[PDB]
Amino acid sequence: LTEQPNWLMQRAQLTPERIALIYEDQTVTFAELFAASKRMAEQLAAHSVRKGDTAAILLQNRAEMVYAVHACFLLGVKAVLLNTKLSTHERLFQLEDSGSGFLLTDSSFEKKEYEHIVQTIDVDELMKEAAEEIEIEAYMQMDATATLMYTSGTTGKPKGVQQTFGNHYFSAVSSALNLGITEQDRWLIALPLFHISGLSALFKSVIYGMTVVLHQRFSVSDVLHSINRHEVTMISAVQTMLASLLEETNRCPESIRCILLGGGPAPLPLLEECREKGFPVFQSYGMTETCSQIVTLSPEFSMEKLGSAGKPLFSCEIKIERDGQVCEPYEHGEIMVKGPNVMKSYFNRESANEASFQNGWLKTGDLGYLDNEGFLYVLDRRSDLIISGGENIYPAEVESVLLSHPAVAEAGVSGAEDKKWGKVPHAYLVLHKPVSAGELTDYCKERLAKYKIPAKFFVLDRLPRNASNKLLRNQLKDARKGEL
Amino acid sequence: TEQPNWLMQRAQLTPERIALIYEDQTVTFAELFAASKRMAEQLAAHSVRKGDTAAILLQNRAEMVYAVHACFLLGVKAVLLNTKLSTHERLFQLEDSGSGFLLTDSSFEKKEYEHIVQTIDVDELMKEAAEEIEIEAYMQMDATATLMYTSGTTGKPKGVQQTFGNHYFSAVSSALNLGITEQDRWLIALPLFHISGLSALFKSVIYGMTVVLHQRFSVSDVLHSINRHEVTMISAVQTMLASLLEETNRCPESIRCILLGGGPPLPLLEECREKGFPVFQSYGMTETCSQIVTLSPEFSMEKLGSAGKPLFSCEIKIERDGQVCEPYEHGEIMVKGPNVMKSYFNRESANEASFQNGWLKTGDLGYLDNEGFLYVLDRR
Numbered sequence: 126l127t128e129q130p131n132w133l134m135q136r137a138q139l140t141p142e143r144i145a146l147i148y149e150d151q152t153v154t155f156a157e158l159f160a161a162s163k164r165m166a167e168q169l170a171a172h173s174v175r176k177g178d179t180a181a182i183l184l185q186n187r188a189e190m191v192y193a194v195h196a197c198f199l200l201g202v203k204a205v206l207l208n209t210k211l212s213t214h215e216r217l218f219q220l221e222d223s224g225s226g227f228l229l230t231d232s233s234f235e236k237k238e239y240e241h242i243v244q245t246i247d248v249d250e251l252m253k254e255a256a257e258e259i260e261i262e263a264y265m266q267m268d269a270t271a272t273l274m275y276t277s278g279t280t281g282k283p284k285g286v287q288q289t290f291g292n293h294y295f296s297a298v299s300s301a302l303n304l305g306i307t308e309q310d311r312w313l314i315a316l317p318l319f320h321i322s323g324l325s326a327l328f329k330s331v332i333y334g335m336t337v338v339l340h341q342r343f344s345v346s347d348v349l350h351s352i353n354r355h356e357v358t359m360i361s362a363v364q365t366m367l368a369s370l371l372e373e374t375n376r377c378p379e380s381i382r383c384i385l386l387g388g389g390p391a392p393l394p395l396l397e398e399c400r401e402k403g404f405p406v407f408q409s410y411g412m413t414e415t416c417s418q419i420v421t422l423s424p425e426f427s428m429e430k431l432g433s434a435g436k437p438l439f440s441c442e443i444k445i446e447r448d449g450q451v452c453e454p455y456e457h458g459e460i461m462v463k464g465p466n467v468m469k470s471y472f473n474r475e476s477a478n479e480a481s482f483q484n485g486w487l488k489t490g491d492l493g494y495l496d497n498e499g500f501l502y503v504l505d506r507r508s509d510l511i512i513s514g515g516e517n518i519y520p521a522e523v524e525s526v527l528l529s530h531p532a533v534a535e536a537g538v539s540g541a542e543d544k545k546w547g548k549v550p551h552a553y554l555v556l557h558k559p560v561s562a563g564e565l566t567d568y569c570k571e572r573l574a575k576y577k578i579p580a581k582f583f584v585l586d587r588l589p590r591n592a593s594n595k596l597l598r599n600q601l602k603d604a605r606k607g608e609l
Numbered sequence: 610t611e612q613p614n615w616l617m618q619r620a621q622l623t624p625e626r627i628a629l630i631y632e633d634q635t636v637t638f639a640e641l642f643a644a645s646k647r648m649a650e651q652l653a654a655h656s657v658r659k660g661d662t663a664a665i666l667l668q669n670r671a672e673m674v675y676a677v678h679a680c681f682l683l684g685v686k687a688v689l690l691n692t693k694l695s696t697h698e699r700l701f702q703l704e705d706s707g708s709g710f711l712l713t714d715s716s717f718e719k720k721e722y723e724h725i726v727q728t729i730d731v732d733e734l735m736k737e738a739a740e741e742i743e744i745e746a747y748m749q750m751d752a753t754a755t756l757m758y759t760s761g762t763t764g765k766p767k768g769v770q771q772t773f774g775n776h777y778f779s780a781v782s783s784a785l786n787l788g789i790t791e792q793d794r795w796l797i798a799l800p801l802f803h804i805s806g807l808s809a810l811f812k813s814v815i816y817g818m819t820v821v822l823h824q825r826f827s828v829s830d831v832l833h834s835i836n837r838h839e840v841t842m843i844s845a846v847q848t849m850l851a852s853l854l855e856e857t858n859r860c861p862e863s864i865r866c867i868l869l870g871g872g873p874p875l876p877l878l879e880e881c882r883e884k885g886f887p888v889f890q891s892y893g894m895t896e897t898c899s900q901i902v903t904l905s906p907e908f909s910m911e912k913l914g915s916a917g918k919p920l921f922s923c924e925i926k927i928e929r930d931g932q933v934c935e936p937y938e939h940g941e942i943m944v945k946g947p948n949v950m951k952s953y954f955n956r957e958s959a960n961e962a963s964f965q966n967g968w969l970k971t972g973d974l975g976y977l978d979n980e981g982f983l984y985v986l987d988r989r
C-alpha cells in the first residue's frame with residue numbers, strides 16, 4: 126503493498142550524483158533535485174499549503190515545474206496539471222472543479238485573473254523566500270491520488286482523471302519491461318509536462334534513476350543538437366514531430382534506440398520511411414486515463430503490422446466489446462482496457478464513472494479491433510462515428526485519404542443530415558495548393574468505398590480545435606467557404 | 610490486486626522467445642505454456658483441485674519448471690523441497706505445509722511418502738492422457754504462490770509464504786537495479802528449490818528472458834554453456850565464483866553480471882575486480898524472496914566488504930533495544946518492502962516476534978556507514 130518510499134527521496138539516497146534533469150544545458154542531480162523540491166515544499170508550506178490540499182500548476186516546461194510536482198508529493202498535496210493553452214474560462218472551470226486552493230505559476234501568465242478563486246503563487250518569487258524546515262512525506266501511498274489530469278475530449282465538459290502513485294509506478298515498470306533499461310539511457314522530453322506523455326517521464330526518471338533531457342518546446346534543430354550533445358537514447362514524440370525529424374535528417378542519430386510514438390494515428394508512408402532510414406519507431410496507444418501508453422508495437426512489426434498500435438504492455442489487458450458481447454477478430458467494437466496503470470476513477474464524475482467501468486474494465490470511448498494474433502488496430506472515437514444509410518463512416522479514415530493528398534494540409538470529416546441517407550460525409554479542408562474537387566473525388570474514388578467519399582467539400586484557413594489541437598468535428602458546421 | 614498469469618501473458622506477447630535452455634533442447638514461452646497447461650490438466654485428473662498444496666521433490670529439469678507453472682495454472686500452492694535434506698526433514702515439511710500431493714520421480718523413493726501424501730511420478734504423469742481444463746488466468750498478488758522452508762538452525766524450520774506479489778516486485782526491483790537488455794540470458798546452476806534459482810523462473814516470464822538451466826555446478830560445463838548460449842547474467846555462491854576464477858584467467862566477454870549471494874571473501878573480491886569479473890555482492894534471504902540489498906562493482910573498493918544498498922521500493926534499518934542505531938553503531942538488521950514475505954505458515958509466535966510495524970527483524974546483525982551502505986556481521 127500500500128506504500129513505497131518517496132521515489133525522489135530514495136533515488137537521491139541510492140544514486141545521489143546521477144543526473145536527474147538536463148535543461149538549458151544546466152544539470153541537476155537527483156540529490157539536488159530532492160534538495161530543490163524539498164526546499165520548494167517548505168516554501169509552499171509557509172503559504173498555508175497543508176497536507177491534503179490541492180494545488181494547480183500552470184507552467185511551461187521548466188526545471189522549476191519539475192520541482193513543483195515533486196514538492197507537492199513531498200507535501201502530500203494533489204497536483205493538478207493545467208494545459209497552458211486553455212482560455213481563462215477553461216482554466217477557471219478546471220480550477221474550481223478540481224477543488225484547487227492554490228495555483229503555482231509564473232510571470233508569463235496573468236495570475237491576477239484567478240486570485241478570486243485560488244491563492245496564486247509565483248514560482249520564481251517563492252524560491253526567493255525563507256522558510257522553516259519541514260519533515261517531508263517519506264512514503265507515497267499507492268492508492269492515493271498523486272496527480273489530477275483533465276481529459277481533452279471533444280465531447281462534453283472535460284473530466285479530471287485521478288492518477289495514483291500506484292498508476293504512475295506501474296506505468297514506468299511496464300514500459301521498462303517492454304523497452305528494457307540500460308544504465309546509459311537518457312530520455313528527451315519536448316512534449317508538455319501537463320500532458321501525460323511528458324509527465325510520466327519524470328516518474329520514469331526517479332524510478333529508473335534515468336536522466337531526463339527537458340525541452341520547453343519542440344524545434345527539430347534544438348532537439349537534434351540535444352540528442353547528439355547528450356547521447357540521448359530515448360525520445361517521445363507525436364506524428365508531426367516525427368515527420369519533421371525525417372525532413373531534417375537522412376539517418377537516425379546512432380544514439381537513439383527508441384522513438385515512442387503516440388497520441389494518435391500515424392500515416393503508413395511515414396512509418397515506412399522510418400523503417401527505411403533506420404528510425405526505431407515504437408507505435409503506442411494510450412490515454413490520460415491509462416497514465417500513458419498501455420499498448421505498444423515493435424519496429425520489428427511496423428511494416429508487418431503497419432497500422433497497428435501493438436499489444437498490451439505486461440500486466441495490462443485489452444478487449445473489444447459490442448453491446449456487452451466480446452468481438453471476434455477484425456470485428457469492430459469499443460476498446461476496453463485493464464491494468465494497474467489504469468486510473469482510479471474520474472474525479473467528481475458519478476455518471477461518467479459508472480458508465481465507463483464494467484467489472485474492473487475501462488471503456489475507452491475508442492473504437493477498434495484485434496486481428497488473429499491479437500494486435501490492436503485503433504479506428505476512431507465512437508462519439509465521432511458517422512452513419513450513412515446504416516453504414517459506418519469513421520472520420521479518421523476519410524481524413525487520412527484526404528490528408529495524403531499534397532494540396533490538402535488539414536482534413537475534417539463531419540456527418541451532415543441527408544434525406545436519402547441517415548447522414549452524408551462532408552470534408553472541411555485547409556489547402557497548400559488549390560485542388561479541383563474533381564481531382565479530389567477522383568482521389569477518394571481509388572481509395573474509398575463509394576459511400577465513404579465526402580459528398581461535398583469545404584475550404585478553410587483553420588479548423589476548430591481545442592487546447593490539445595484535437596479536431597472539434599461537431600463544430601465544423603460551419604466556419605467558411607466551400608467550392609466544387 | 611491481480612495480474613494475468615505471467616507465463617500466459619508472456620506467451621501471448623512473445624511466443625517464440627526462448628524461455629528455457631535445458632541443454633541442449635530449447636523451450637519457447639509458447640511451448641513452456643503448453644507444457645505447463647498439459648501437466649496442469651494431468652494433475653487435475655489426479656483430483657488435484659484449486660486451493661490445494663503440492664510439494665515438489667525434483668532436481669533441476671525442464672519438468673520441474675513445468676511443475677511450478679502447472680501449480681500456478683491450477684491455483685495450487687507449491688512447496689519446493691530441498692533434495693539434499695534427509696527424509697524425515699521432508700516429512701516434517703510435508704506435514705507442516707499441509708501438502709496433499711508430492712510431485713517427484715524415480716530418483717526418489719515414492720511410498721516413503723505415500724503414507725503421508727499422495728505421490729505422483731512426474732515422468733509417469735506426463736505420459737498420461739487427460740481432459741482439457743480452464744486454467745487460472747489470473748494471479749492474485751496477495752495469494753501464496755510458493756511455500757519455502759527456512760533451512761537454518763536455532764529452531765524448527767518455518768514455512769515462508771511467498772506471494773505472487775512478492776515475486777513480481779522481486780523481479781522488478783532487481784531489474785531497476787541491474788537493467789534489462791533484449792539480449793539478456795540468465796544462467797542458473799543453483800538448485801531451483803532455493804529462492805536464488807526459483808526467482809530466475811519468475812524473472813524469465815516477467816522480463817521475457819531466457820534462462821539457461823544446469824542441474825549442478827561444474828565449472829567447465831558452465832563456461833562452455835556460457836559461451837555457447839552467450840550468457841550475460843549468472844547467479845552463484847562464493848564456492849562457484851572461486852572455482853570459475855581458479856579455472857580461467859579472462860572473464861567471458863558475454864557475462865555482464867555475476868550475482869553473488871549467501872555469505873562472504875574480502876581477498877577474493879579484489880581477485881575479481883582486477884580480473885574483469887562483474888561480480889555483484891548481495892544480501893537477501895528466503896524471507897525477502899531473494900536479494901533485497903545489492904552492491905555495485907564500481908563501489909566495492911570504497912565499500913570494502915559491504916552488502917550494498919537497498920533495491921528500489923525496499924528499505925533497511927539497524928535497531929538495538931527498540932531504538933534506531935546511528936551510523937557504524939551495531940544492531941539488528943531489519944528489512945521492509947513489497948518483496949518481503951507476508952507471514953510464516955502456521956507460526957503465530959514467530960510472526961509476532963519477527964514483525965514490528967511492517968518491518969521484518971532478520972535475526973541478523975550489521976550497521977550502516979556514513980554513505981548508508983550495509984555492512985553485515987552475524988546472526989544472534
Ligand SMILES: Nc1ncnc2c1ncn2[C@@H]1O[C@H](COP(=O)(O)OC(=O)CCC(=O)c2ccccc2C(=O)O)[C@@H](O)[C@H]1O
Nearest residue numbers: 322361362387388389390409410411412413417418491503
Ligand atoms: N496510436 C493511436 N492511434 C489512434 N488513436 C490514438 C492513438 N493513441 C492515442 N489515441 C487517441 O488519443 C486519445 C488519448 O489522448 P490523451 O488522453 O489526451 O493522452 C494521450 O494521447 C496519451 C498518449 C501518450 O501518452 C504519448 C504521446 C506521445 C509520446 C509518448 C506517449 C506515451 O504513451 O508516453 C485516445 O482517446 C485515443 O483514442
Ligand SMILES: [N]C1=N[C]=NC2=C1N=[C]N2[C]1O[C]([C]OP([O])(=O)/O=C(\[O])[C][C]C(=O)C2=C(C([O])=O)[C]=[C][C]=[C]2)[C]([O])[C]1[O]
Nearest residue numbers: 805845869870871872873891892893894895899900973985
Ligand atoms: N552477503 C551476505 N553476507 C552475510 N550474510 C548473508 C549474506 N547473504 C545472505 N546471508 C545470510 O544467509 C541468510 C539467508 O539464507 P537463505 O534464506 O536460506 O537464502 C539466501 O541467502 C538467499 C540468497 C539469494 O537469493 C541468492 C541470490 C539472489 O539474491 O538471487 C543469488 C545467488 C545466491 C543466492 C540470511 O539470514 C543472512 O544472514
Ligand SMILES: [Cl-]
Nearest residue numbers: 214215218282
Ligand atoms: Cl468549459
Ligand SMILES: [Cl-]
Nearest residue numbers: 307308785788
Ligand atoms: Cl539502472
Ligand SMILES: [Cl-]
Nearest residue numbers: 447457458459
Ligand atoms: Cl459499433
Ligand SMILES: [Cl-]
Nearest residue numbers: 779898899900
Ligand atoms: Cl527479492
Ligand SMILES: [Mg+2]
Nearest residue numbers: 440612613615
Ligand atoms: Mg502479468
